[PDB]
């Protein structure tokens, strides 16, 4: 356990150096928690509101993330999170479906376009069950709309 | 030493209760149960829940899902619903890939549980595995059929 704090710090340092070197600080942030090292991407850099298709302009960002993931062996868990708003549609009848569609759409890009191996990935949808703070203000809901790319321990 | 055995014995009792529930309610043709390192797992082949390539829960399945919700109501565990496909690459306009179909199927089950059966949202996690976790492999049509499934994981 004492040596796995060192390797988690090494990885977080490597990810933060990659973000610096590639000038990605406005598009993503990285952190460390019990899951491992986590890249957080706000909804606006990947999708339109209430949609789960990866925007053409997000492809460069996901490519740069793929380049990083290609150099490490860890399994990758992509989590989708929504705010608590009801923006239901025919394609996404609830936040469960929307959050799971966003996670799986990111993974579809990583595996089908960037050719990272499917076996490294798990798609996870949390709907609105894991807010950053809450959904009591517009700013709090906006930060709840995110994808988290978890570089698993 | 007795702690490993204690936890494993408790998991044995949980699986026994689930199997007895399946038996007593005459559900053997629709679902099976097993356990592994994740916990105790209910397995539902896709045809008891969905039509082919779709993630809309069938009206037929509402009775089965209600009986499962009654079971889930009696235990406190977190519930992880996993969607699985076989390895055959099919797309569609709404589900461009097995990743999206598998996650939409897990999501659709949870949405039924939380909207229609009123189980609390915070108990659930939706998981999509595409074809990465076969029951055994994809070497035969019958193995591919059993791979198209939803697993409801009663987490440890």
Author numbering:
A (entry chain A): 84 to 236
B (entry chain B): 81 to 236
What does the report in the manuscript say about this coordinate set?
Bs-MotPS assembles around the rotor depending on the external Na+ concentration. The crystal structures and SEC analyses of MotS68–242 at high and low Na+ concentrations revealed that the periplasmic region of Bs-MotS is in a folded state and forms a homodimer regardless of the external Na+ concentration.
The crystal structure of Bs-MotS68–242 was determined at 1.89 Å resolution. The N-terminal 15 residues of Sub-A, 12 residues of Sub-B, and C-terminal 6 residues of both subunits were not modeled because of poor electron density. α1 of Bs-MotS68–242 projected from the core domain as in St-MotBc. A short helix following α1 of St-MotBc and Va-PomBc does not exist in Bs-MotS68–242, and α1 of Bs-MotS68–242 is connected to β1 by a loop composed of five residues. The subunit interface of Bs-MotSc is formed by α3 and β4. β4 forms an inter-subunit hydrogen bond with β4 of the other subunit, forming a ten-stranded inter-subunit β-sheet, and the side chains of α3 interact with those of α3 in the other subunit. However, the helix–helix interaction of Bs-MotS68–242 is hydrophobic, whereas those of St-MotBc and Va-MotBc are hydrophilic.
